[PDB]
Amino acid sequence: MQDIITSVINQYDLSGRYLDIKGINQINNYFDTGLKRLMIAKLINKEATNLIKEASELLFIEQPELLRPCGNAFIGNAYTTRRYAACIRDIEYYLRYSAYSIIAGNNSILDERVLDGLKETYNSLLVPIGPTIRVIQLLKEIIQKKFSTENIENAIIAEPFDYLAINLSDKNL
Amino acid sequence: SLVTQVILSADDELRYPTAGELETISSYLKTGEYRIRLISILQGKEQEIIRLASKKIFQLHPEYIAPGGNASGARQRALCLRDYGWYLRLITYAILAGDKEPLEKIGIIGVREMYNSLGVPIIGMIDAIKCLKEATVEVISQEEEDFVAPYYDYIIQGMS
Amino acid sequence: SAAGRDIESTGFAWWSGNARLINVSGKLLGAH
Amino acid sequence: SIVTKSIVNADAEARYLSPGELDRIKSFVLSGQRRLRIAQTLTENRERIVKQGGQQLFQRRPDVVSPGGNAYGEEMTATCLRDLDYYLRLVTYGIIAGDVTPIEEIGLVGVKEMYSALGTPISGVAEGIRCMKDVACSLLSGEDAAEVGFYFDYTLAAMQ
Amino acid sequence: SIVTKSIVNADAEARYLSPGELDRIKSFVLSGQRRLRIAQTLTENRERIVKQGGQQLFQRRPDVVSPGGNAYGEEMTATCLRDLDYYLRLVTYGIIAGDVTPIEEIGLVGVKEMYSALGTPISGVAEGIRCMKDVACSLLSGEDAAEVGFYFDYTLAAMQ
Amino acid sequence: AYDMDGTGAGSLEPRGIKSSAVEKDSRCFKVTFVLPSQSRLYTFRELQNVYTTKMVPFSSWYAEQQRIQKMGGKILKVELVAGGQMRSVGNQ
Amino acid sequence: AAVGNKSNVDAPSFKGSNMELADSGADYKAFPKRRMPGANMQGFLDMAKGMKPK
Amino acid sequence: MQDAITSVINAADVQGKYLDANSVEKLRGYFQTGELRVRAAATIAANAATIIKEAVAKSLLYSDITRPGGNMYTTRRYAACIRDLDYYLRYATYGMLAGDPSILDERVLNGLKETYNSLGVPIGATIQAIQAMKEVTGSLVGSDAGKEMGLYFDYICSGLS
Amino acid sequence: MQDAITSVINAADVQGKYLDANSVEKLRGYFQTGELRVRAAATIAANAATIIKEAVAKSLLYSDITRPGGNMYTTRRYAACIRDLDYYLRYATYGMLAGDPSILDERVLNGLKETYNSLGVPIGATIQAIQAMKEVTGSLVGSDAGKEMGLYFDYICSGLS
Amino acid sequence: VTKASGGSPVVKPQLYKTASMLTIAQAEQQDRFLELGELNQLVSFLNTGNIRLEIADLLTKNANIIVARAADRIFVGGSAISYLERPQASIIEANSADIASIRQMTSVFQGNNATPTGFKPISVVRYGPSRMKKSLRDLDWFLRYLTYAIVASDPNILFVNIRGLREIIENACSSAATIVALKEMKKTSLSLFPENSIQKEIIEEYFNVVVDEFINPALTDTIRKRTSNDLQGLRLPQIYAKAGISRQKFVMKPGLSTDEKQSVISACYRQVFERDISKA
Ligand code: CLA
Ligand SMILES: CCC1=C(C)/C(=C/C2=NC(=C\c3[nH]c(/C=C4\NC(=O)[C@H](C)[C@H]4CC)c(C)c3CCC(=O)O)/C(CCC(=O)O)=C2C)NC1=O
Ligand SMILES: CCC1=C(C)/C(=C/C2=NC(=C\c3[nH]c(/C=C4\NC(=O)[C@H](C)[C@H]4CC)c(C)c3CCC(=O)O)/C(CCC(=O)O)=C2C)NC1=O
Ligand SMILES: CCC1=C(C)/C(=C/C2=NC(=C\c3[nH]c(/C=C4\NC(=O)[C@H](C)[C@H]4CC)c(C)c3CCC(=O)O)/C(CCC(=O)O)=C2C)NC1=O
Ligand SMILES: CCC1=C(C)/C(=C/C2=NC(=C\c3[nH]c(/C=C4\NC(=O)[C@H](C)[C@H]4CC)c(C)c3CCC(=O)O)/C(CCC(=O)O)=C2C)NC1=O
Ligand SMILES: CCC1=C(C)/C(=C/C2=NC(=C\c3[nH]c(/C=C4\NC(=O)[C@H](C)[C@H]4CC)c(C)c3CCC(=O)O)/C(CCC(=O)O)=C2C)NC1=O
Ligand SMILES: CCC1=C(C)/C(=C/C2=NC(=C\c3[nH]c(/C=C4\NC(=O)[C@H](C)[C@H]4CC)c(C)c3CCC(=O)O)/C(CCC(=O)O)=C2C)NC1=O
Ligand SMILES: CCC1=C(C)/C(=C/C2=NC(=C\c3[nH]c(/C=C4\NC(=O)[C@H](C)[C@H]4CC)c(C)c3CCC(=O)O)/C(CCC(=O)O)=C2C)NC1=O
Ligand SMILES: CCC1=C(C)/C(=C/C2=NC(=C\c3[nH]c(/C=C4\NC(=O)[C@H](C)[C@H]4CC)c(C)c3CCC(=O)O)/C(CCC(=O)O)=C2C)NC1=O
């Protein structure tokens, strides 16, 4: 992976030049929000086991089909508790790697460890991609409930969850 | 501790500690006594805190106290405060050696199978630690309780 | 579930151990 | 949208965007405040725009809901209104994108193959969208009804 | 036996025995009365089963007993029948064990190395066991001859 | 070939176990040790005996002895059963 | 019984109904013949009752 | 790894003789108890976790091996116990079905007492746990079945001593 | 990897309904042939080497794949055949017991024809070996049992084609 | 966006075992025809056969009676059995089993003891419909995998889907309101058979596998910690790995029988060379 810093330094190494001030201004924008990026992360560790629970009920309250028999399409939704146990486990990962990626200030950790082969894996097990992405942003609204009076923490929290949404899409447009 | 993690993590690569790691030891040792000053604050409030933990773990969960529950009876409740005492004692270790291993080599690794063979509901113990963290905020000011806050919720993350 | 038949399950001792039925309405109806 | 195909137009021609293309991206983004208000009206009127949309559709095409019609019974009639909720949604996309490009590659390209392959009368679903158009333009002023109705009749044109 | 390898199967898999394994240990021990009767028939018929066994073996393979054959003379022919008494004994073990596990690790594992290293035609000793099989199954009913013959042909299979 | 080509720090293959074993070495130890897994309580795999006594070669005793202590093992006894001592030529 | 009696005209087949017994319904396809309205869709079924009677 | 039938066949085979009246006499004795052993192994499979929970609470639950410094203090160390006691109750079930304790020393006993001395596991508390586990096992399977399952517990306790 | 009971349970489960009369109707049909399949799998286990020896000698023993240049010339290549034919006679035995050819394409058919094209193994001679192997298998197990075991041979031959 | 792709082969995850199933797989994994012990394994469960099957239909036919008699015990508020919804997939049909519950428009007691002590039964009107839309659905399902375990070989499919189940629904359910309902199905299902006949002991043993294991702590999640940096740690419910054939291992304890020492060594050949060349 690469944080915002190492990604910035590779940006200037490829061109083989020292760090100018436009390069350093990008680093300073991380160092300013870096102290704010932690209690976002620290709130997630304190709210982790909860925030998955509100995401699941908010998901199945709109997708009751996911708790039902699959139809003859052998599809992996949360039908059985074996299916339900593993299916809650995926929400663990989406909250986790989107928690590191809040601290790195860059989605490099996301795609190489979550996105690479994600459509591969779900197409094998026939897993829902639609509801799978919707639960990713149910977490985003749920996390943004805590930091809401101001609006500069909101763009920070949105960046990891928004990146998984745009990338797991089969592109309609 | 933290130096032990650097010696170990540098030892499996067969190299001396790098520039960043020696920061991680140097910055940890410069914040030394403040953990030492903090643990003496908590040791003087162990009878403080576990009395407050038994406040809300049982008003939240009268299932365990009632006749039939695991904690019913005097001697069952007697060790009940002892488990709080060992956990609070473990957290003073974790607050000092600035990482999670004393909370992980003890207490966390294999805790569910310990409780499941005891009859203690593992979900109830999660609220017990969450109750214990709720109790530590009152006898501690705002400066230093967020220093000790991340050591508590690691235990909750470890127990799930 | 079941609740309140001890000293440190309600706070009241045995000589007050008829007043563990204040917040327990089902046993209190069978008490009357 | 107007931004993406004004680009891919000038993209193919090996050139940048003319004033005719850049004075309209400019003119479109200043129009963006008024577009979100129009789409905001149709967003939380889907209960009436769809249900009254299927109102006139069955009064004008009782065959499709009569026994033997494609949308017969409690089941198909629910899906009978589901498609109208789809096409009403795509019109909200076209209003915000300033073009039928969202409506083009969703619900229009190859639509006759789907509905012919589902046994649905494609002329019947065209009648449904026209009934939604009179309900939609009745909810807005004249300056807006020349837009919201404007995207429906394009969907009417491509749907036959 | 069926008891020991149904165990070591479930032993390796870190699990207990399924109903499929325990309804067959159950089914085998109720079969144990009938197995001892079958082995009791072959036990005191070894005089005829072996001597008539070597009867057809020499009529079908006169080379092995002719001058130059491996079992030539008064000496080798006695040992020529000794091996048939061995393999007839192991079949009595397999019938009582309900498996060729006794026949497997005795007289079958590495049998080609022995007989190749003794100069004996391994195909010839396979012909001897087949001649014993027709004598053995001629001594029992059809329900039994599907077992006693069943263990011989396994020995025939592994012996080539 | 052998494990001492010139590799040390700052070299392309990663810094790792470097044994002083010659070309096709024929020396082997007889070691004895216990090695508790220290990882079964979050993996829940089946259990295997940890007290083993086996012949490890000289070509890879150092890696094994360096690893047995990596996971907290204790080495009770080792010997050089096969091979000579101070032997310039002949370890091959 | 066939009852082929006479005057087997062709035109004018009329109406009414009878719904004769199935068979062979004793075979065994593993999948149903599919139908709708899952959940994600209870909203619109209840809601197409609204216009059902019109 | 021999059962009663394997051990009978081995001794009758090792002398090169057939299964005479004495060899089949013991085999008939094993088939008579075949019905008892399965039901004994049936209930033990059902109450595996309950038996181990009863033994540790009855023998070594509150002793000071359980308290700090004792041999069973940390949760990894406590969890290793019920994992460890599961094998004794499991392998004893195998000996009860096979009717021969050969599987125990083959797969449990060898290198066992030599391993506990390495770790420093108290052999004294271990045997009393198995003795208490033997006591509850006689509760479930009955008297004679408990006599059978109990006959392999003390075999473990004897060799582990 | 599903048998007839697994496939019946899957289709009845995939619609979320219980095992109605039609699902149990096929299950009763499978239990009726349960006695036939075991005896079919019994004799095939006994005459495994004899069946493969009969098939190769009857189909491709003396053809010029056997001679130099043919696809089966060297002893490693000849030995790979009877190893290879053993799987077809073995996995077909599994399909005959399970009553469902799901195990074949799961463990045999997938990547098989794509593998023989890589090695250059003649698919034409392979199917005729299996056809001849199917012919001898109907000799042993009888007519209807041969119809059952034969029903999975041509399934291999069809997909391998 | 991902700029590469490994492909997605069709994979059917394991769901359960059956007695007809795993023994076909055990000798399969050892690369052998099943032997006469295992051929004797596959036969007499097929010989169980119609006995297993008839237990389904007699249990399946009065499925409503099995479910309703639990509804009388632990659900206040009249019938409260309307929220049943047997077809749970929204299909038109292919075919349906027959149940045929209440006909005309708790009848006789004489032994009926459900709640062991002062257990509060759920109300219904206060319990709300949406939560009520599961409780009859799960009292349904406990009738189901039991009638899939009878029709299958083992109770294994119950064990996978009932292990952590009570924990997951523990917050929206009083757990003791399940143990009462699950012990009403065996008391109802034992009304069907002449007891001390063979079928009476079969289905009884399958009920106490699900109800006693229902009151049982959930398995702990298995963790896969990685050794070096570039790997990533995973985590799997222990439910997930105990469903299916569950591939076996081989160990070389010196002192085994020389076959099981031979089956393990030849098992080592197939692992490293992919084909037992000593056999080949
Ligand atoms: C309808 C009347 C009524 C009711 C329901 C209650 C209810 C209650 N009172 Mg109360 N009380 C009452 C009248 C009542 N009181 C009267 C009339 C007085 C004045 C005497 C009191 C004085 C009083 C005190 C001082 C206390 C209570 C307490 C309590 C609570 C627990 C009771 C207990 O554990 O006693 C258990 C019973 C006993 C220990 C037995 C006492 C026996 C007495 C001393 C002898 C009675 C003599 C009698 C006339 C003849 C007996 C015959 C003899 C031969 C045996 C409970 C809520 C306690 C409380 O605050 O809890 C919240 C408390 O501390 N009450
Ligand atoms: C770190 C990034 C990452 C992810 C996300 C990941 C997912 C992942 N999800 C899996 C299964 C699964 N996932 C689900 C999930 C769902 N079912 C539904 O109906 C819902 C849409 C959804 C829950 C939101 C189910 C049911 C299975 C099991 C499929 C089956 O066996 O039937 C499996 C196979 C089991 C295993 O873990 O070994 C993997 C690997 N792996 C990764 O490395
Ligand atoms: C250092 C880490 C560590 C812990 C935590 C530990 C716990 C532990 N808890 C135990 C029992 C117990 N623990 C409880 C606990 C409780 N009841 C409740 O309602 C509560 C939520 C909870 C206490 C806060 C009960 C009721 C028992 C007795 C169960 C019985 O034996 O019947 C036992 C059996 C012996 C004993 O009490 O000492 C151990 C070993 N051991 C360790 O080494
Ligand atoms: C976003 C663009 C878009 C559209 C439009 C769309 C349509 C669509 N319409 C369907 C069914 C259907 N559609 C109808 C529709 C009608 N019956 C009538 O009488 C009327 C004329 C008409 C509605 C106004 C009926 C009856 C079915 C069910 C047909 C069947 O069950 O065989 C189905 C199959 C079931 C489903 O998955 O919903 C699809 C995919 N999908 C899309 O992605
Ligand atoms: C229980 C399993 C088992 C077997 C089978 C076995 C065989 C065995 N066969 C032997 C010899 C022999 N075996 C034969 C056998 C034959 N000659 C023929 O023509 C026939 C084809 C064939 C017999 C049907 C002959 C001729 C010798 C003596 C060879 C010599 O003297 O060089 C010997 C050496 C002498 C002795 O110790 O008996 C052994 C050990 N040992 C075992 O433990
Ligand atoms: C981390 C703790 C640790 C140590 C210390 C260790 C030592 C160790 N030293 C070795 C050899 C050796 N060590 C020496 C050392 C010396 N010769 C002298 O004259 C000097 C006195 C001395 C240098 C100070 C030599 C020459 C060999 C090679 C011996 C041979 O080829 O026979 C070997 C044999 C294998 C190999 O080198 O690849 C090991 C395993 N292993 C460990 O895990
Ligand atoms: C199948 C035959 C067999 C047995 C029996 C066996 C035992 C065995 N017990 C072990 C540990 C252990 N065993 C215990 C057991 C106890 N502590 C007590 O106070 C009690 C007396 C006792 C429980 C009855 C403990 C606490 C450990 C952990 C020791 C440590 O972490 O240092 C270990 C170390 C590795 C591990 O557990 O992962 C092994 C290999 N291995 C086998 O293959
Ligand atoms: C279980 C499902 C399954 C099958 C079927 C399978 C086949 C398979 N057949 C192979 C080779 C082979 N297969 C043959 C077979 C034949 N030559 C002929 O002329 C005949 C038409 C045919 C015999 C019927 C030969 C000669 C080779 C060796 C090819 C070579 O050395 O280039 C090889 C290469 C590796 C090896 O044999 O060790 C594989 C992997 N693998 C599987 O996992
Ligand atoms: C075939 C074996 C099997 C069962 C039974 C099973 C149950 C199961 N019950 C669930 C929930 C639930 N189950 C119930 C109720 C109850 N459950 C009971 O066993 C009681 C009869 C009743 C309480 C008295 C309720 C109220 C919920 C919703 C809980 C929630 O909102 O999270 C869920 C989560 C999805 C859902 O909302 O339905 C599963 C997966 N899964 C299985 O694989």
CA dist., res. H71 & res. H73, Å (int): 6
Largest CA distance in chain A: 60
Closest-CA residue to H152 (of H80, H78, H66, H89) = H89
How far CA B15 is from CA of B1, B9, F73, in Å, comes to 20, 10, 21
The token pair at J274 is 């992919």
Phi and psi (nearest 5°) for J263? Answer: -70, -25
Q: Round to the nearest angstrom and report the end-to-end CA distance of chain F.
A: 12
The token pair at D4 is 């993406």
Task: Flag whether I39 is marked binding.
Answer: no
D:105-134 residues touching chain A, CB 8 A cutoff: 105-106
C21-27: long-range contacts, CB 8 A cutoff, minimum separation 24: C26/J118, C26/J120, C27/J118
Using a CB-CB cut-off of 8 Å, the residues of chain J touching A115 are 1-2
Hey, which of A87, A94, A116 would you mutate to test ligand 2's pocket, going by the most ligand atoms within 8 Å of its Cβ?
A87
Task: Flag whether B131 is marked binding.
Answer: no
- Subunit partners of chain H (3 or more CB pairs within 8 A): B, E, F, J
CA dist., res. J27 & res. J31, Å (int): 6
In the block, tokens 């709300």 appear at: J128
Q: Round to the nearest angstrom and report the end-to-end CA distance of chain H.
A: 22
Residue minimizing CA distance to atom 22 of ligand 9? J135
How far CA G35 is from CA of A65, B122, C26, D116, E49, in Å, comes to 14, 44, 49, 18, 70
Using a CB-CB cut-off of 8 Å, the residues of chain J touching G32 are 91-94
The token pair at I131 is 């056809």
In the block, tokens 């990663």 appear at: F14
Pairing between β-strand J234-236 and β-strand J222-224 as defined by DSSP bridges:
antiparallel
The token pair at E79 is 């040992």
Query: Residue F81: in which H helix or E strand, if any?
Result: strand F74-82
Looking at the CA of residue A88, tell me the nearest atom of ligand 2.
23
> Å from J173 to nearest chain A CA?
15
Which one of C1, C5, C7, C9 makes the best mutation probe of the B interface by having the most chain B beta carbons within 10 Å?
Answer: C9
Determine the distance separating the centroid of ligand 9 and the alpha carbon of G33, expressed in angstroms. 28
* D75 Cβ contact list (under 8 Å, min separation 6): G35, G36, G37, G45
Residue pair J176/J233 in contact by the 8 Å Cβ criterion: no
Among F41, F47, F51, the residue with its CB nearest the CB of H118 is F51
Residue pair D153/D94 in contact by the 8 Å Cβ criterion: no
Looking at the CA of residue A114, tell me the nearest atom of ligand 2.
2
The token pair at A2 is 């690469």
Resolution in A: 3.3
Residue pair H35/E32 in contact by the 8 Å Cβ criterion: no
CA dist., res. A140 & res. A164, Å (int): 11
Residue pair E98/E35 in contact by the 8 Å Cβ criterion: yes
Length of chain A: 173
Residue pair E102/E28 in contact by the 8 Å Cβ criterion: no
Secondary structure of chain E as H, E, C letters = CHHHHHHHHHHHCCCCCCHHHHHHHHHHHHCHHHHHHHHHHHHCCHHHHHHHHHHHHHHHCCCCCCECECCCHHHHHHHHHHHHHHHHHHHHHHHHHCCCHHHHCCCCCCHHHHHHHCCCCHHHHHHHHHHHHHHHHCCCCHHHHHHHHHHHHHHHHHCC
CA dist., res. E24 & res. E26, Å (int): 5
Q: Can chain A be said to touch chain I, i.e. do they have 3 or more Cβ pairs within 8 angstroms?
A: yes
* I151 Cβ contact list (under 8 Å, min separation 6): none
- J222 DSSP β-pair partners: J236
Query: Residue J273: in which H helix or E strand, if any?
Result: helix J260-273
Residue pair H150/H137 in contact by the 8 Å Cβ criterion: yes
Length of chain C: 32
Looking at the CA of residue F65, tell me the nearest atom of ligand 6.
43
Looking at the CA of residue F37, tell me the nearest atom of ligand 7.
38
Q: Which residues line ligand 7 (CB under 6 A)?
A: F 36-37, 40, 47, 49-50; H 65, 71-72, 76-77, 80-81, 84-85, 87, 107-108, 112, 115, 119, 121-122, 125-126, 129
The token pair at H114 is 């030599």
Please tell me which residue of chain J has the smallest CA distance to G26. J95
Instruction: Indicate the DSSP class of residue I105.
Output: I
A22 burial (CB, 10 Å; 0-12 / 13-18 / 19+) is exposed
Count the Cβ atoms, other than its own, within 10 Å of residue C29.
9
Q: Confirm or reject contact between G50 and chain D (CB < 8 A).
A: yes
How far CA A155 is from CA of A105, A162, G53, in Å, comes to 11, 10, 50
Chain-centroid distance of CA F22 in Å reads 15
CA dist., res. I101 & res. H107, Å (int): 39
Q: Radius of gyration over alpha carbons of chain B, in Å?
A: 18
**DSSP calls for F23-57:** TT---EEEEEEE---S-HHHH-PPP---EEEEEEE
Q: DSSP alpha helices (H): ranges in B12-73?
A: 19-30, 32-43, 46-60, 62-65
Closest-CA residue to E18 (of B91, J156, J106) = J156
Q: Is the sign of the CA dihedral J113, J114, J115, J121 positive or negative? A: negative
CA dihedral of residues E125, E129, E132, E133 (deg, nearest 10): -160
* B9 Cβ contact list (under 8 Å, min separation 6): B21
% helix, strand, coil for chain I, step of 5 = 75, 0, 25
How far CA E6 is from CA of A26, E16, H2, J98, in Å, comes to 67, 10, 12, 41
Q: Radius of gyration over alpha carbons of chain D, in Å?
A: 18
CA dist., res. I148 & res. I38, Å (int): 12
Pairing between β-strand F74-82 and β-strand J234-236 as defined by DSSP bridges:
unpaired
Chain-centroid distance of CA A88 in Å reads 15
**DSSP calls for B105-150:** TTTTTTHHHHHHTTT--HHHHHHHHHHHHHHHTTTS-HHHHHHHHH
Instruction: Indicate the DSSP class of residue J20.
Output: T
Closest-CA residue to I82 (of I115, I44, I104, I50) = I50
* D37 Cβ contact list (under 8 Å, min separation 6): none
Using a CB-CB cut-off of 8 Å, the residues of chain G touching D76 are 36
Largest CA distance in chain J: 75
**DSSP calls for J132-176:** HHHHHHHHHHHHHHHHHHTTSSSSHHHHHHHSSHHHHTSSSS-TH
Q: Radius of gyration over alpha carbons of chain G, in Å?
A: 21
> Å from A73 to nearest chain B CA?
33
Determine the distance separating the centroid of ligand 5 and the alpha carbon of B9, expressed in angstroms. 64
E117 burial (CB, 10 Å; 0-12 / 13-18 / 19+) is exposed
Q: Can chain E be said to touch chain B, i.e. do they have 3 or more Cβ pairs within 8 angstroms?
A: no
Count the Cβ atoms, other than its own, within 10 Å of residue H73.
16
Q: Confirm or reject contact between C26 and chain J (CB < 8 A).
A: yes
Taking each helix axis from N to C end, the angle separating D46-60 and D122-137, rounded to the nearest 10 degrees, works out to: 130
Q: DSSP alpha helices (H): ranges in chain A?
A: 4-14, 21-33, 36-46, 48-60, 81-104, 108-110, 118-125, 130-144, 152-167
The residue type found at E41 is: T
J142 burial (CB, 10 Å; 0-12 / 13-18 / 19+) is buried
Cα atoms in the Cβ-side hemisphere of radius 13 Å centred on I53: 6
* G46 Cβ contact list (under 8 Å, min separation 6): D78
Q: Radius of gyration over alpha carbons of chain I, in Å?
A: 18
Residue pair E23/J42 in contact by the 8 Å Cβ criterion: no
In the block, tokens 């966390």 appear at: B108
- D69 DSSP β-pair partners: D67
> Quick one: which ligand is closest to J279's CA?
8
Phi and psi (nearest 5°) for D155? Answer: -65, -35
> Å from A150 to nearest chain J CA?
32
Largest CA distance in chain B: 60
Taking each helix axis from N to C end, the angle separating H48-59 and H75-98, rounded to the nearest 10 degrees, works out to: 120
Instruction: Indicate the DSSP class of residue I109.
Output: I
CA dist., res. I144 & res. J79, Å (int): 54
The token pair at F14 is 């990663």
CA dist., res. J180 & res. J142, Å (int): 13
CA dist., res. I127 & res. I124, Å (int): 6
J235 burial (CB, 10 Å; 0-12 / 13-18 / 19+) is middle
Using a CB-CB cut-off of 8 Å, the residues of chain I touching G26 are 22, 25
Q: Confirm or reject contact between G26 and chain I (CB < 8 A).
A: yes
CA dihedral of residues A127, A128, A131, A136 (deg, nearest 10): 50
Query: Residue D108: in which H helix or E strand, if any?
Result: none
Using a CB-CB cut-off of 8 Å, the residues of chain J touching C1 are 119-120, 174, 176
CA dist., res. B94 & res. A159, Å (int): 33
Q: Is the sign of the CA dihedral J203, J205, J206, J211 positive or negative? A: positive
CA dist., res. I150 & res. I139, Å (int): 11
